[PDB]
């Protein structure tokens, strides 16, 4: 029920409730060191998150360019040598200059197509062919997804 009280004198013994009281004095010394550790640990994490957010928010801010998603090419998550989905890589071995992670192909509205490692903040479920996604105006990284736009002839129909 609840330990360490007169009800429990009957069920156990006097000596038992005391060694319990004594063993929990052992226990609690340990638990104040760990709670303090873990408290500090989440702070270090949160503050590196805010540091991250300030870069991302600069890029997120207006304006930004508009592209559609040609296709999702796919690339292996093996960065500990090379990509070999079906296209083996030659020459020199690299962490991330030809051994990159998963990939997005986009078609911009400046009349080109660009091959980038897909952004680690947009998931590969939210990338599928023919989605309209925002892209960074002066680079080309996918910040976010957008609802498909139409013409103004189409918005008249509404």
């Amino acid at each position: 029920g609840d330990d360490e009280l007169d009800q429990e004198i009957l069920n156990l013994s006097t000596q038992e409730l005391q060694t319990r009281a004594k063993l929990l004095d052992n226990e609690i010394r340990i638990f104040r060191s760990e709670l303090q550790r873990l408290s500090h640990e989440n702070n270090v994490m949160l503050e590196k998150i805010k540091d991250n957010k300030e870069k991302i928010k600069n890029n997120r801010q207006l304006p930004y360019l508009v592209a559609n998603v040609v296709e999702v090419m796919d690339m292996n998550e093996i960065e500990d040598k090379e990509n070999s989905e079906s296209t083996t890589q030659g020459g020199n071995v690299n962490l991330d200059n030809t051994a990159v992670g998963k990939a997005a192909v986009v078609k911009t509205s400046s009349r080109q197509t660009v091959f980038l490692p897909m952004v680690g903040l947009v998931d590969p479920d939210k990338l599928k062919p023919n989605d309209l996604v925002g892209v960074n105006k002066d680079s080309y990284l996918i910040l976010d997804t957008l609802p498909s736009e139409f013409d103004s002839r189409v918005k008249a129909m509404e």
């Binding site: 010394r29 104040r32 500090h40």
Partner: protein, 197 residues
Amino acid sequence: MVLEATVLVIDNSEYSRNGDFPRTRFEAQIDSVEFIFQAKRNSNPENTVGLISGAGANPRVLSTFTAEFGKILAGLHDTQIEGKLHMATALQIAQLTLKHRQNKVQHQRIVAFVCSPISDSRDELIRLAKTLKKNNVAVDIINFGEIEQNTELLDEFIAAVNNPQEETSHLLTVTPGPRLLYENIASSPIILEEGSS
């Protein structure tokens, strides 16, 4: 006292699983760190604490001078038990850490826990003791290792450091029977210390 920067040296050894202090001597020295940090802090809030280990073939710097108790703590976790504390190298490491401070006004102090009967020479540590007091560094040797039988090498060390100097060296011998390390350290002088000019 006040305005004092303290490297606490925690001893790490194969004699730190002993039941001579509950639950073991390692975990007792854990609590001990916390109390001394807060004591210094509530006397005056410009004081800082660094933390070094003995684990390793040579001691190591885990944390330089910080005002955060929690940074000191991530270190104690990170650290092992399987090394041995050699005083001569631990002292020398504490001094280099002491040449980096939040404010340079602050005095120089070493607190050293001992859970290892010293296996370093007496003579080696006499030279080093004379090294400390030029800089104004005093060393408080909390002895609970040589209560397993070993002659007091320390009497010579504390004495060599001791002189006109407002940071004072102290020798505290802790009761061999179970009675909790940290309590006894906390109740002895660490803020109820005095000068000795």
